[PDB]
A paper describes a structure:
All of the fragments for which crystallographic data were obtained bound to the adenine-pocket suggesting this pocket to be a preferential site for fragment binding. Analysis of the fragments’ binding modes showed that four of the fragments (5, 14, 15 and 16) were coordinated by hydrogen and/or halogen bonds, whereas the other three fragments (3, 9 and 10) appeared to be stabilised only by apolar contacts. Fragment 16 (3-hydroxybenzisoxazole) made one hydrogen bond with the side-chain of Ser211 through its hydroxyl functional group (Kd = 6.5 ± 5.7 mM). The binding mode of fragment 16 revealed two potential routes for fragment growth: (1) growth out of the cofactor-binding pocket from C-4 or C-5 and (2) fragment growth from the 3-hydroxy position along the cofactor-binding pocket from the adenine site towards the nicotinamide-binding site. In addition a small hydrophobic pocket adjacent to the fragment was detected that could be filled with a small hydrophobic group by substitution at position C-6 or C-7 of the benzisoxazole so as to increase interactions with the protein. Through growth of fragment 16, the binding mode of some of the new modified fragments compared to the parental fragment had changed. This is likely to be due to the fact that fragment 16 initially only formed a specific interaction with one side chain (Ser211) of the protein and thus, through growth of the parental fragment, e.g. further addition of functional groups, the position of the new fragments can shift in order to be able to increase the number of specific interactions with the protein.
Human 3-phosphoglycerate dehydrogenase ([name]) is responsible for the NAD+-dependent conversion of 3-phosphoglycerate (3-PG) to phosphohydroxypyruvate (PHP), which is the first step in the de novo serine synthesis pathway. Thus, [name] activity diverts glycolytic flux into biomass production. Limited proteolysis with thermolysin revealed a stable fragment of [name] consisting of the core of the catalytic domain containing the cofactor-binding site, and this was shown to crystallise readily. Thus [name]-93 provides a valuable tool to investigate binders to the cofactor-binding site.
Residue numbers in the entry:
A (entry chain A), B (entry chain B): 100 to 294
The structure:
Amino acid sequence: NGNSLSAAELTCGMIMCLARQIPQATASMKDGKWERKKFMGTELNGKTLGILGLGRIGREVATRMQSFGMKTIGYDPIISPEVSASFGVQQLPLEEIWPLCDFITVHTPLLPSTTGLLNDNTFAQCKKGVRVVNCARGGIVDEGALLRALQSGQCAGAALDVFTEEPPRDRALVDHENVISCPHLGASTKEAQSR
Amino acid sequence: NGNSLSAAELTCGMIMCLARQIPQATASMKDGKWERKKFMGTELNGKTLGILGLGRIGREVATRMQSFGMKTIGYDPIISPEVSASFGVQQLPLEEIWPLCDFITVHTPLLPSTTGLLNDNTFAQCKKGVRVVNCARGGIVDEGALLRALQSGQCAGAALDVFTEEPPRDRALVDHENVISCPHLGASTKEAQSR
Ligand SMILES: Oc1noc2ccccc12
Ligand SMILES: Oc1noc2ccccc12
């Protein structure tokens, strides 16, 4: 609400970080290395971003990423397709979303229907090399399934602000070379903090 | 041209990384830490972005950062104020730009007139806490002056894709906690590479 924009901005930051491996490149630089060929990335323009959860944060993410030329599609059980069209999000059923996306971002509450929304089944339906972002609630993305998808290359990268347990006690995700992370910083701006 | 969008996209990534310290937070997480107060950041909405160089890259940066609610102002001696108005950038003389900006990004060639465009004299005219990006040409930002500004806090952070010498032999900038960097990745996308 107040803090909608801080979350939406972090999410868009994470999308850009996944496309260009900025965190990993800075780490490489700080370790004294100049590794240009390693950190070959991708352009956002013309890519498809799937947005799962089309409330305020989802809508804000959409309109920012639309300025990058991304195609924004998505799904939300409550919001009508004509309403999401009005903010440039094409709604399709979930089963249709997975194979189209280059990037997926989640913006749902944590409910039975959204716990493990991304799981071994839904990762297998994605395009090989999909990049995922969770700046919403820990557990929306099944962490074990994510790890397996990163290990196989079915997922080329992931950005996590939130974890099933905080701080995460299992470190295998965090430590993966294709995972970027923050300690639940979505609301952590001076502005959000200070109404 | 071909590669305009890859440079512009990286620049926008770097601005979001400065606002939220994504690379430093990832490093902290990978070292097993959970440091929430350390990485309190700022919101981009409502802030002023100064764009120095209003050719194709500069214009693309402007229109993307406008979607975040940033006020975009700038300077370019060759681009008419009418042309820059067409993409929502108010041109002002340099002297008027420095004090207004929360963020500054450079998109000029390297010429006598732009070597040290940001230097001790122009840092001194900036708002305390300014954040700077150079994804254009190494030497636009004077490296010794940038280090002095980061040491005093006159500059709160900087993002560098390019250096006066590549790789930089002096590591004090790269090693600073408030500096984000990449090994000249601006054109390093699969797309740019493959027309
Ligand atoms: O409850 C939900 N809010 O947004 C969703 C998106 C996908 C599946 C379920 C939900
Ligand atoms: O000479 C210049 N080329 O582009 C510029 C932008 C700002 C200030 C000077 C110049």
